[PDB]
Amino acid sequence: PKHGKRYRALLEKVDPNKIYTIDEAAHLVKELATAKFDETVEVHAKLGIDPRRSDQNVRGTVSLPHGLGKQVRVLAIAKGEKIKEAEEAGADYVGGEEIIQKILDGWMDFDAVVATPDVMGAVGSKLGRILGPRGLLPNPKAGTVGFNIGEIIREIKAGRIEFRNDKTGAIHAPVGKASFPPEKLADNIRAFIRALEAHKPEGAKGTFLRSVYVTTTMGPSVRINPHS
Amino acid sequence: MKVILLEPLENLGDVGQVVDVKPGYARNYLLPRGLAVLATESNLKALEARIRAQAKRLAERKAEAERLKKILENLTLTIPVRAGETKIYGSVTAKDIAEALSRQHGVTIDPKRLALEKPIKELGEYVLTYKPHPEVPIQLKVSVVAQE
Amino acid sequence: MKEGIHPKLVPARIICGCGNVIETYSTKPEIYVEVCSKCHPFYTGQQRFVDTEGRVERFQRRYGDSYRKGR
RNA sequence: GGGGGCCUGACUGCGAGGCCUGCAAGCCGAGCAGGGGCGAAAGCCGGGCCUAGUGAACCGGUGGUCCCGUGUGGAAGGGCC
RNA sequence: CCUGGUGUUGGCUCUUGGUCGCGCCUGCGUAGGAUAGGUGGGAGCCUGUGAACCCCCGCCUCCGGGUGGGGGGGAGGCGCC
RNA sequence: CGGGGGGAACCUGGGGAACUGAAACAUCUCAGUACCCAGAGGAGAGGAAAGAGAAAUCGACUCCCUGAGUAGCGGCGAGCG
RNA sequence: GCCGAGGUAGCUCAGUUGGUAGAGCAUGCGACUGAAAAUCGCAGUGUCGGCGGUUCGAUUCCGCUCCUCGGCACCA
């Protein structure tokens, strides 16, 4: 009973028997793993739903009210001052129907698409074709369409994350920084607690937030109790 | 079904138990017999009757044991042997101890429980280990010498 | 009288019905049973001292005969 | 009656008063108020060109209500739409 | 009358199925060094093999190969790129 | 030492019915009625509250009037009450 | 109305990553068939009952919908 991971020391730190609580989690994670740089600790969990009927395929976003400037690239598709507002705020990819055109040709360097209502027809119908069957098309009920382009990418770089559940039923997201202030990490674990509880479709019946854990990139695995 | 055991331990393993033998099962199957009874403040009492009983009996054993333990570990036991400056002609049998101490000095102890691999005939004396009760072993100064 | 109980009396009566529900799930029941019935217990024994029996009925039975098990 | 533009009154609360009528039926309705909709507007629109496309009462369901609850705060249940 | 459950209707043992908990192994359409099961976090990882060179063995099949151990030892390999 | 066998109507408990009504007739009504029975009497019946009741209130049982034919029971039908 | 069930080419059966489809039998052409059937070779040959949908992609995965068959409680 021994495995292949010098992780051995750190795992020794671990000890799966008590799914404990948030702040504890911030601290133990923080101590747990600063490999070659500082851990990109994160949170992962699963929900008692069932995507075979998208009536619960959840996603949205809780703005971890803490600094950033990375993750899931985004294209701000609009016109003039919206391009201003958006790129400004903090947009990886920025433009209008010419950037969309680039997409038609062969460019979707943007995982997510945030288009304002001044190019929504062009985005959704030009790129309806291109971005529809994947999920990279701005949708007026999918955190992807809004005149608030600057506010939007603003968040994208000041402190963004967002949600989305993968196949079988789980969600993946960053709820704090490794070495980051523990209490803080708690603040974010919660940010997620809330936003999630929110997104949580009404097609539930029992244990919804089934397993909620603070775990790290390449590091430890600690189940947690985001109730307290 | 508070089944009280007379001769049971899930076999004739007697008193010392009470288990559940489901309805009739228990009834006429496991206790009609001559192997047990059932609850009753009466039977429970029974358990108390001899639990107490034995608690006092054993307690006692302990006690009388103690009186002898003390008297004997206290006193010395000298015996009139006959012979040369080593082993007497026909040994010191710890039973020799037994009756000699018994009625020439006062208290008796059965031969058996003592500490005598081979009778000892060296003479002189040794204080040895003879356990009058198995948690309480009585040691004592046994001297025999040629009154030749 | 040849089968009340012995460890008291359980020997009789009753009129019994029947229909077909749907009450608090859909509509009214359905009733058409002006019927009549029996309804009873059972018998057994043990020994005073080589020689005995019992007779008796069911429950009141069982713990009862136990009572005489006390004596 | 043939075509085209916009639009839903194929409205609620209501209807004075008349048609046949023993019953309950069924039938016609100016105008009043909120509220729209067609016209610029004199106004017309509470279904269709009309007479047949039909069923009391019960029991029970469902979308409101937020009236009653058997002590009382509830609730099952319950009354009305 | 036949007919599950259940009550008196107790013992010993052979046994096979579902379900939840934990553990293991598992995913080969084509491009893909290559049998990519998902979706995360993510350029770093490791030295009880001093090495991916070779050795057998245990295991799962759709050629290869994936995986888990024992051994042979003299700073390399692999992930990133 | 007692019972038993009686006794017109009366009483308690056991068991327990069609007509007829519902202008049919099956829940229902006639009814817990007629009838078979056991049993106490001179009367049996019931008889100090796990009662009634919502005001911090009554207080065994029985019977007469009243309480309502209301509260209500129900092919919410005949009716019952 | 409930649940188990059948529905694709002329006849009738097939797949749980779905992600690539028919097959046995008739129909067309060609050898063996000196006749024939039978045989073999080939071809032709299709929405997997309807629609969207989870779905890069699933017709077998998600929900509702036709006509159907088997067994249950509906109108009192």
Curated annotation (Swiss-Prot), chain A:
GO cellular component: large ribosomal subunit
InterPro entries per UniProt: Ribosom_uL1_bac-type, Ribosomal_uL1, Ribosomal_uL1-like, Ribosomal_uL1/biogenesis, Ribosomal_uL1_3-a/b-sand, Ribosomal_uL1_CS
BP GO annotations: regulation of translation; translation
Gene Ontology MF, one: tRNA binding
Keywords from the named record: Repressor, Ribonucleoprotein, Ribosomal protein, RNA-binding, rRNA-binding, Translation regulation, tRNA-binding
Quaternary structure and interacting proteins, as annotated: Part of the 50S ribosomal subunit.
PANTHER family the UniProt entry points to: 54S RIBOSOMAL PROTEIN L1, MITOCHONDRIAL, LARGE RIBOSOMAL SUBUNIT PROTEIN UL1M
Family: Belongs to the universal ribosomal protein uL1 family.
Protein's job: The L1 stalk is quite mobile in the ribosome, and is involved in E site tRNA release. Binds directly to 23S rRNA. Protein L1 is also a translational repressor protein, it controls the translation of the L11 operon by binding to its mRNA.
NCBIfam families assigned to the protein according to its UniProt record, in alphabetical order: rplA_bact
Name under which the protein is recorded: Large ribosomal subunit protein uL1
Species for this entry: Thermus thermophilus
Gene: rplA
Swiss-Prot record, chain B:
UniProt keyword list: Ribonucleoprotein, Ribosomal protein, RNA-binding, rRNA-binding
Coiled-coil spans in chain: none
GO CC annotation terms, alphabetical: ribonucleoprotein complex; ribosome
InterPro entries in the cross-refs: Ribosomal_bL9 (IPR000244), Ribosomal_bL9/RNase_H1_N (IPR009027), Ribosomal_bL9_bac/chp (IPR020594), Ribosomal_bL9_C (IPR020069), Ribosomal_bL9_C_sf (IPR036791), Ribosomal_bL9_N (IPR020070), Ribosomal_bL9_N_sf (IPR036935)
Example GO biological process: translation
GO molecular function: rRNA binding; structural constituent of ribosome
Family recorded in the similarity comment: Belongs to the bacterial ribosomal protein bL9 family.
Entry function: Binds to the 23S rRNA.
Descriptive protein name: Large ribosomal subunit protein bL9
Organism the protein comes from: Thermus thermophilus
UniProtKB/Swiss-Prot annotation, chain C:
A GO molecular-function annotation: structural constituent of ribosome
InterPro entries reported for this sequence: Ribosomal_bL28/bL31-like_sf (IPR034704), Ribosomal_bL31 (IPR002150), Ribosomal_bL31_A (IPR027491), Ribosomal_bL31_sf (IPR042105)
Keyword field contains Lipid metabolism: no
Binding site for Zn(2+): 16, 18, 36, 39
GO biological process: translation
Keywords from the UniProt entry: Metal-binding, Ribonucleoprotein, Ribosomal protein, RNA-binding, rRNA-binding, Zinc
Protein function: Binds the 23S rRNA.
Family according to the record: Belongs to the bacterial ribosomal protein bL31 family. Type A subfamily.
Cofactor: Zn(2+)
Domain of life assignment: Bacteria
Record text on cofactor binding: Binds 1 zinc ion per subunit.
GO CC annotations on file: ribonucleoprotein complex; ribosome
Self-association state and partner proteins as the record states: Part of the 50S ribosomal subunit.
Protein name: Large ribosomal subunit protein bL31
Taxonomic placement: Bacteria, Thermotogati, Deinococcota, Deinococci, Thermales
Record's keyword annotation contains rRNA-binding: yes
